[PDB]
Structures are given as C-alpha cells and as structure tokens.
Amino acid sequence: ASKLRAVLEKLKLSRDDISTAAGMVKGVVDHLLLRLKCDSAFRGVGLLNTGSYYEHVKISAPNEFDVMFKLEVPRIQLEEYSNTRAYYFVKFKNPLSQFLEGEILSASKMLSKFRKIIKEEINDIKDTDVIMKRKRPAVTLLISEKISVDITLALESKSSWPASTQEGLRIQNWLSAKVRKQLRLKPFYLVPKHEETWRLSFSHIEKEILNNHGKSKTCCENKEEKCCRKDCLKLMKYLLEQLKERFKDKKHLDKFSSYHVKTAFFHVCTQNPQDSQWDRKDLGLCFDNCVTYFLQCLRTEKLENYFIPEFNLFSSNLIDKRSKEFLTKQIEYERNNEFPVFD
Ligand SMILES: Cn1cc(-c2ccc(F)c(CNC(=O)c3cc(Br)ccc3O)c2)cn1
Ligand SMILES: [Zn+2]
C-alpha cells in the first residue's frame, strides 16, 4: 500500500506537467467540427463536453487522446435486436435520410461519410501533418508523429433511457434515489458495432459519478474525508493496461477493455456505499477487494453490465473461459507479488 501510492504519485507527475498535445488536438478537432457542421447530415455534430478536448482512455500513454462527437436524433424509434438487451436497431418517425436502408439506420453508410469528410479536411492543414489510419473508435488520426486522436460519433436522444436500463444503475444506497433520477434525465448515446446495430454509451454518466462520488456531499473536499474511490479505479485500469501491453503480442487479453474494469468497480461502490469503507488510509485493502471482486467475476463468468443488468459482459459466449482463466492467472500472480507490472 506504500507501493501503490508510489504508483499513483508517478501517474500524476505525468498527467500534470506541460505538453503541447492539447493545442495540436484542439486545433484539429475544431477544424473538423466546422467542416462537419458544413454538411447537412452532420449539421448538429458537436463535442460531448466543450472544454474537454482531453479525455485519455489510456492512463499510461498520455499521447493517445479520445474524443466523441454527438449528433442529436429527434424522434428516435429504438428496437432491441435478438433479445440481447444491449444492442438495438435505430429507426425514425430527416437529415440522416441518405443513410437509411428501409426503416433502419445504417452505421456503415454513416461512418463512411463521417470518414470521407474527415479524410478531406485533414489536408487543409499545412500547419500540422495529420494522417488517418484504416480501422479493424470510428476514426483515428495521427497528428505530427507522437499524438493520436480516436474520434467516435454517437447518436444522442433526449428522450428517456431505453426500457432495458430500468432496474439498472442501482446507486440508490450510495449516491441516492434523487440523484439516480437526475442522471436518468440526462440524454443517452448510441454508438455502433455488432447487422447495423447500436449500443448505449454511458461515459457521460460515469464521468459525473466520478466527480461526485461519495455518500457525503463533501467527500474529498477536505482532509478529514479524503477517500480512495478514484485511486482504486486508476489502479484497476493501470493493472489491465499494463497487462494488455505485456501480452499485446499474444491474443489472450484482446477481449478486455477499460470498461470491464469500470463496470466491476462501480459494483463494489454499490456493495460498499459508505465513505467510511474507502478511507484514504485503507487504500491497500480497498484495492485488494476490488482485485478480488474482478477475479470473482472472471471465475464465475458473471459480471452484470452496470446499466443493463440482464446483460453479462463475461458470459461464456462473449468471452471464452480460456482467456478469462488467463486474465485470472496474471492478476492473481501480480497480487501475490505486490504488482511488479506497475514498473
Ligand atoms: C467499450 N465498450 C463498451 C461496450 C458496451 C456494450 C454493451 C453495452 F450495453 C454498453 C453500455 N455501456 C456501459 O455499460 C458503460 C459503462 C460504463 Br462504467 C461507462 C461507459 C459505458 O458506456 C457498453 C462494449 N465495448
Ligand atoms: Zn471521495
């Protein structure tokens, strides 16, 4: 636990210090935003959080940025695909008309114009050299030679969340019912990727919980109630990242993302709603409990999506047991040796 705060300390003195990347990424995103608004099918495109041109998926490499473009779709009609609970067909009741296939909205057609427009504005820049990669995040730019930006297009609906989210977000005992209501009055977002099916994105709700995360309204506003909810999250993610880097060559960890680690983390927060159970001085315990809960989801092949509870990110179909037994192998090995992968 003395070693964990060393790691947290290291990450900060790399988050913090001066780096021109923001300017380069700011200058390219606002060019794109304009030329995007130029075209009718994207006239409403905008950043999911202005002034937040900076969101880093990867907490180790701080040269890899990731921003999301929203585009409202009024009068949406949603249709759940194949009893999946999580994936849907997008329909209507129209600027996006050039992208349909019958009553159904095609993500392929829609990204394909999103991409081609972007590939065009990028050579309007003799300021910075910008390059677009082919895919296999909708679009990825390499700015100069170090920085890379992952762009994501997301439909936005201001109507209330899809029926599958009803018993979800069980934060009543921790953040409170009246907060849960507020958050569910926020819009929801749909991003592609199986059919032309879309799925919900809740990065905006995650962020809000994280900036206001205690049962106490004054959690982390003074010395007397500093917790370690965020710290346990960063460590969970850094664990998975570093592991994924290790076996970037093999294919064993390709099915895991930061979001399996956020999902399991918020579950713990729901099991442990008191700030007294996250005191900044129990950081070693609290992290261990997180490690133990993640693991337990791996073994039992059960980890409920935090927002759509009948949807199991670890079901034997979504990720096969062989790779979950491998992820178990390395994390357990790290925890038994005080986490050498952190260096
Ligand atoms: C990266 N990735 C995501 C999915 C996915 C799939 C199905 C599905 F229903 C959802 C719903 N999103 C979340 O649960 C979510 C939870 C947190 Br915590 C923060 C943001 C989020 O968007 C997501 C697949 N790959
Ligand atoms: Zn706190």
From Swiss-Prot:
Changing residue 12 to E: Strongly reduces stimulation of interferon production. GTP binds at residues 50, 150, 199-206. Changing residue 70 to R: Reduced sumoylation. Changing residue 11 to A: Impaired type-I interferon production in response to DNA stimulation. There is a cross-link at residues 12, 119, 178, 207, 234, 237, 250-251, 302 (Glycyl lysine isopeptide (Lys-Gly) (interchain with G-Cter in ubiquitin)). A lipid is attached at residues 227-228, 297 (S-palmitoyl cysteine). Mg(2+) binds at residues 64, 66, 150. Induction: By type I interferons. Changing residue 230 to A: Abolishes enzyme activity. Abolishes stimulation of interferon production. Abolishes DNA-binding but does not affect translocation to the nucleus following treatment with etoposide. The modification Phosphotyrosine is found at residue 54. Residues 12-54, 207-230 are annotated as: DNA-binding. Changing residue 234 to R: Loss of ubiquitination by MARCHF8. Changing residue 219 to A: Abolishes DNA binding and enzyme activity. Changing residue 75 to E: Abolishes stimulation of interferon production. Strongly decreased interaction with nucleosomes and tethering to chromatin, leading to constitutive activation in the absence of DNA. The modification N6-acetyllysine is found at residues 207, 215, 217, 237. The enzyme activity is strongly increased by double-stranded DNA (dsDNA), but not by single-stranded DNA or RNA. DNA-binding induces the formation of liquid-like droplets in which CGAS is activated. Liquid-like droplets also create a selective environment that restricts entry of negative regulators, such as TREX1 or BANF1/BAF, allowing sensing of DNA. A number of mechanisms exist to restrict its activity toward self-DNA. (Microbial infection) Nucleotidyltransferase activity is inhibited by different herpesvirus tegument proteins (Herpes simplex virus 1 tegument protein VP22, herpes virus 8 protein ORF52 and herpesvirus 3 tegument protein VP22/ORF9). Viral tegument proteins act by disrupting liquid-like droplets in which CGAS is activated, thereby preventing CGAS activity. This is Cyclic GMP-AMP synthase. The gene is CGAS. The chain holds residues 162 to 520 of 522 of the full protein.
